[model samples]
Target: MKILVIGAGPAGLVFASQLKQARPLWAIDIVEKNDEQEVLGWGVVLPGRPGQHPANPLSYLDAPERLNPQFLEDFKLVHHNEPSLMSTGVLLCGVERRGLVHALRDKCRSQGIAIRFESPLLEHGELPLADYDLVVLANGVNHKTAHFTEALVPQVDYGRNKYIWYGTSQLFDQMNLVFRTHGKDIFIAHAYKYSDTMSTFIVECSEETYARARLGEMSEEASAEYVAKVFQAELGGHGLVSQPGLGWRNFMTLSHDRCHDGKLVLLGDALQSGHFSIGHGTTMAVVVAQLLVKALCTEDGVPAALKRFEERALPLVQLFRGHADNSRVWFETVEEREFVQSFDARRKSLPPMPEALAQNLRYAL
Candidate 1:
């Protein structure tokens, strides 16, 4: 069978790679809109599995030990030794997003899967859909899956807060949520070490705080400088690294009511997205790709495979979506002022101030 995979991201590349491995005779082509060197985000975080679990929970993404044991054996720099902050009781590992792409691409390349870089398919018209037996739309949240047919309804919402996905030289031992308040504004930063020398730092604030800090009106360079100044203590005097596209962007939640329409299957971020606060977007993408391949592994044709995928995966996907919905509502409705005050109140309860929050003032770890 001939397969066309759009969007050379984790989902697309993984689906292409594993499917190629499963069916060596199948023809597969993966198309990407950007160059191989281009990456938007700094790092991807994956929660580790306990030695004895019913199945891997808290992470839908294939852990290095599962999907590709070679990753765990090879990329020691990407592994985090510390545990996650979430109540899930799992350690989290962070990998540079580009490094992951390179690994996945290499896996695909070894399998003789053809990858076409800088080839964009904005709509179904741009895709040679009729020529391929299967078209995997792993193009992430922004793809035009609805354009395929009216049945593929898309429900999208932009999150209420403004956030910037950035990197920092400050090496965090584990996933850290540093909450800070400046006058009427409140800021929360999520940082985690992805490598020995570098980490991913994501800054978030309400629209009111964003406006109060004049981040909305500032230039990209000015904004990066201001962010560094505001969160200097959290950085331990280290600088927050900035890139060409690492300014600020709102998180968006995109999901399709139906994951498949005929031969085309929606995978990863294209299928659904969880809030970044929960950190499951990449996980969902990885899980969906594996599930799709699992369904296809059956001798059944594309129609049966698609049906089996939806029937089994949709319920599990919805369970996560419900939690994501809760997270979205919590952030959307909670007053940033009170949120910061709650932390401040806790800090005040602890005598004068801990050294951790003393320099940063309202910062609570």
Candidate 2:
């Protein structure tokens, strides 16, 4: 069987590597738009135990050790000028985004999977879809190719909050949700130490706050500087770092009714997307790719495999997507929530519900 995978992102690489390993004689090739060294984001959080969820049947990866993930033990919730609430026994894994992608690419290379970087299957049209027996669309949420979009009919819902992804030298021992209020504006930072010296610090605010803060007018560096001051206490004087082209963006919640059209199948962000606050983006991609691979290897034919993949994966995707939607709503209107106001009014009146709040913040239903 010959397969052509688009976009060498997590979904594409994982699917290609695992499929190649399962069926060594088959021809599998991946085309990535970006160069090997050009990774956009900073850090990603993955499930500590792959396939631990009852609904999920696949392990984290074929080789978990390749990524060198840092297992997080605690989730911390911080309110401005108040004591932090801590929840232990957490099992989220944090790793650099570049490291994870590189590791996956290495796995694919080791398995003799051919990868063509700086080659966009859509723009160049150098590679014909007819040449391959099957085509996998693992590009991403912003994929512009009409061939897959028209068939999949993806629906996108934009969040009310604006967020920016940044890296910081400040080391957070555990995953943290820090909520700070600047006058009437409120901002929340989702931070976690992915490496020894750097942590992923994503700041989010409601559209109202974004306007009130005038963040839209500022340059990327200027905005980073202003946000750095907002979280100065947590940062310990360490400045925030911004990627060159990345700026504030509204989270896009994309969904599709089906994942396949004929021989073309969607995987990862191309198939659907949850809110980044849940930190399950990478996990979802990896899980879905594994399911697709499993179906292809065990099912009779490509059509049967695609059907089985959807039957098993859609429910799980919807479950998490629902939770992610809830989480997005909570963050967008958190300042108006009764709990936040009550907590602020009576600073220490009620005990912090770390477990429940953490659930609401990350994966609430």
Candidate 3:
């Protein structure tokens, strides 16, 4: 069987890799639009499973222990500039986006999967059709996929809020999802220790602020400098963060879930994207990857494999979709955010003050 995998992201790579295992006789080709040095986020968190849960979730991508070596000694959470409490299973090493892409390329090559870079599919149908038994579209949310029911994918447009994914060397131990509010504007700083003195720092703000501050009007360098000036306290005097080799202001998580169109399967964010606030894209993608491999493990061919994949994946997809939807709803309305994050104490889902904050669902364990 000839297999064509589009988008070299984690999910796409998984499909190509595991499928190669299932049918060593099959031919696999992975085509990506970028080079080996492309990445989106600065650092990502890999939540550890409880003792009884499955092993490290990212064996395919990279071992969590191997990734996050120094743990908190290289990173930490400073509430109001003070160290916080401890948590189980330390944060893993932070691999830059380029490093991840390179790693995936090597793995795919080792698996005898051919990779084509800098080549994008303008029209899935027009390009090369009837050549491969199956084509896996792993494009993510940046654009649309051909043959898929485009309407089924959930989309949320945050008109004013602009965000950028960049890395910093400020140094942090535990991951930080810190928020700051000044007057009418809010700034979210999601930082993690990716390396010694280097961490991923994502900055978000309301469109009102981004526009009123002329954020979109400025170059990324200017935007980065502006962000550092605004949040210098958390920055620890570090800048020089690099955006993706391609995009400038990736202020949005444009994603969807249009998975299957007969023989074409949409994997990864191409199906739908998990909101950055939840920080579950990688986790969910990893799990989805496992399911993809399983679906293809059978003797069944492409269409059969995809049908099984959907049956197995849709539930979890719906769950994450629900989570992403709730996140979108909560983010769009400050009132809702206040109710969940910091307000509505006596209301349902909240215990009585400390008792309310005691809810395991809301607070970290």
Local distance difference test, per candidate?
0.67, 0.76, 0.59
Model 2 whole-model lDDT (C-alpha atoms): 0.76
| Candidate 2 ranges beyond 4 A from true positions | 49-68, 123-127, 144-149, 338-365
* Candidate 1 global TM-score: 0.80
Q: Which segments of candidate 1 are over 4 A away from where they belong? A: 49-88, 144-147, 333-365
Candidate 3 TM-score, C-alpha based:
0.79
Q: Least lDDT summed over 10 consecutive residues: which range in candidate 2? A: 356-365
Model 2, 91-150: lDDT tens per residue?
776778887788778778888998899977664355476798788989887553443446
**Alpha-carbon TM-score of each model against the true structure:** 0.80, 0.87, 0.79
Model 1 lDDT on a 0 to 1 scale: 0.67
Q: What is candidate 3's lDDT per residue for 1-365, written digit by digit as tens?
A: 78788788877876677667676888889888876665555555544432222212345554434344334323333344354533333434444544555666677798889888887775645546578777777766644434344554436444245567767778766666555565567766678775555677877666676777776787868778777877787876776365645233433444444457766776777666766665566556556666666677663777787887787566566566655556544554542242222311223242121222123112111
Query: Per-residue lDDT for 223 in model 1?
Result: 79
* Residue-by-residue lDDT tens digits, candidate 1, 1-365: 88999888887886787688788998999988889788777876664542222122213233444332111111111112232233323455676777667767767887899888988787657768789989898887666343465676568778888888878888776666765566666777778777667888888888888888888688877877788887787677887766786677777777666879887888877788777766667655655676778778873789888998887567656655666766666655545222333332332232221121122212110
Ranking by lDDT: 2, 1, 3
Clashes of each: 1, 0, 19
Model 1 is weakest, by summed lDDT over 10 consecutive residues, at 70-79
Residue 84: error of model 3 in Å? 8.7
On lDDT, the candidate that comes out on top is 2
